[PDB]
Structure formats: C-alpha cells, structure tokens
Amino acid sequence: STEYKLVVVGAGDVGKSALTIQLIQNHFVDEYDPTIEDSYRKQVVIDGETCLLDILDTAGQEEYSAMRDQYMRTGEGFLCVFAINNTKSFEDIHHYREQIKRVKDSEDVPMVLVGNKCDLPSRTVDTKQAQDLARSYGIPFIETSAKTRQGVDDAFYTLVREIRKHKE
Numbered sequence: 222s223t224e225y226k227l228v229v230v231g232a233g234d235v236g237k238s239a240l241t242i243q244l245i246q247n248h249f250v251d252e253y254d255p256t257i258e259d260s261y262r263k264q265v266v267i268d269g270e271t272c273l274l275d276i277l278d279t280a281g282q283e284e285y286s287a288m289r290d291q292y293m294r295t296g297e298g299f300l301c302v303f304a305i306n307n308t309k310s311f312e313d314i315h316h317y318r319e320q321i322k323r324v325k326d327s328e329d330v331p332m333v334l335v336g337n338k339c340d341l342p343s344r345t346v347d348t349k350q351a352q353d354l355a356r357s358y359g360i361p362f363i364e365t366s367a368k369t370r371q372g373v374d375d376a377f378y379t380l381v382r383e384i385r386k387h388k389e
C-alpha cells in the first residue's frame with residue numbers, strides 16, 4: 222500500500238479535530254481539547270488503491286521556526302478548513318495557503334478547500350463564494366459536516382487524489 226501524509230490546517234474552532242476523528246473513528250466529538258496537536262493513522266481504499274494515511278491535526282501557537290517549517294514540509298497534502306458560519310476563518314484561508322506554498326517551495330501544492338459545519342442553518346460564507354476562491358486556486362472545494370459525516374470521507378479522499386495526480 223501507498224502512504225500519504227496529510228495535514229489539516231485552519232483557524233481555531235472550525236472543526237479540524239472533529240473532522241479528523243469523524244474519519245478515523247467514524248464518530249463526532251463535540252468538545253476536543255483545542256490545544257492538542259496529534260497524529261492519526263488509518264488505511265482506507267481510494268478508487269481501488271489501498272492507501273495508508275497519516276493525518277496531522279494541527280493546533281497550538283502560530284510559529285515559523287526552521288524546525289516547525291521542516292516538520293510542516295513533511296506533509297504531502299493539506300486540508301484548509303474553515304467554518305461556513307465564521308467569516309474570519311474563511312478570510313484566513315489565504316494565510317494558510319500562502320504559508321503552505323512557502324514551506325513547500327511550490328505554487329501547485331495538493332490541497333482541498335473544506336467548508337465545515339454545513340449542518341448549521343445560518344450560513345455567512347456562501348457556497349459559490351468559496352467555490353470561486355478554490356477555482357482561482359485550482360484546488361477542489363468540498364463542504365463537510367463532522368456531526369453528520371457529510372462529505373468527511375469525500376474531502377479526505379479528494380486530497381489523496383490530488384497527491385496522486387501531482388506525483389505522476
């Protein structure tokens with residue numbers, strides 16, 4: 222099987238830890254420690270190929286030492302996560318993409334835009350608004366809901382396909 226190192230980036234409280242557990246453990250955690258950054262592993266099948274994933278749930282203080290960049294440079298794909306009910310988290314996407322392009326030293330890094338918390342009624346970030354931003358980036362965009370499993374597995378598998386295309 223092929224290994225894929227994934228990194229989940231995004232502002233705080235957007236659902237990175239909830240999305241990560243919903244894919245690994247297949248259940249929703251409504252209150253995970255926001256200061257905890259850990260790595261998870263699970264082997265799934267993606268369009269026939271068996272894929273072993275190592276997903277990094279990022280958290281903690283924003284810091285750009287050579288050790289941190291080198292550790293973040295090990296990620297092959299990135300999930301830039303925002304909340305459809307938090308405008309600021311959607312404006313901070315340009316920050317994470319810019320920092321990912323810097324440490325990876327490339328302008329075509331495999332990544333997928335994630336609009337989490339789509340199960341909530343009041344939405345402030347429009348769907349087509351985030352869709353045109355991902356179209357400008359040239360990256361996929363998927364709306365997910367860690368509570369209802371909606372698109373969770375879809376968002377993660379789409380990122381592995383972007384890595385597959387970039388590799389070949």
Ligand SMILES: C=CC(=O)N1CCN2c3nc(OC[C@@H]4C[C@@H](F)CN4C)nc4cc(-c5nc(N)cc(C)c5C(F)(F)F)c(Cl)c(c34)OC[C@@H]2C1
Nearest residue numbers: 230233255279280283284285289290293316317320321324
């Ligand atoms: C609860 C809190 C929480 O979970 N949080 C909040 C802090 N938060 C991060 N907030 C920021 O800005 C925040 C604001 C917004 C913008 F205005 C600039 N900042 C003032 N920037 C972060 C940057 C990185 C980071 N660092 C590197 N060395 C290299 C790369 C390639 C990255 C990557 F990949 F991420 F880009 C990482 Cl790992 C972060 C960041 O961890 C995630 C945590 C998640």
Ligand SMILES: Nc1nc2c(ncn2[C@@H]2O[C@H](COP(=O)(O)OP(=O)(O)O)[C@@H](O)[C@H]2O)c(=O)[nH]1
Nearest residue numbers: 233234235236237238239251252338366367368
């Ligand atoms: N309604 C709803 N709430 C969510 C969802 N995902 C996360 N949350 C809530 O957002 C809060 C923080 O989520 P968290 O997993 O810590 O995201 P993170 O801080 O960015 O890593 C939690 O109290 C969750 O209840 C979702 O899909 N739907």
Ligand SMILES: [Cl-]
Nearest residue numbers: 245247264265
């Ligand atoms: Cl499973």
Ligand SMILES: [Cl-]
Nearest residue numbers: 282283284289
């Ligand atoms: Cl950091």
Ligand SMILES: [Cl-]
Nearest residue numbers: 284285320323
């Ligand atoms: Cl910098």
Ligand SMILES: [Mg+2]
Nearest residue numbers: 238254255280
């Ligand atoms: Mg978290």
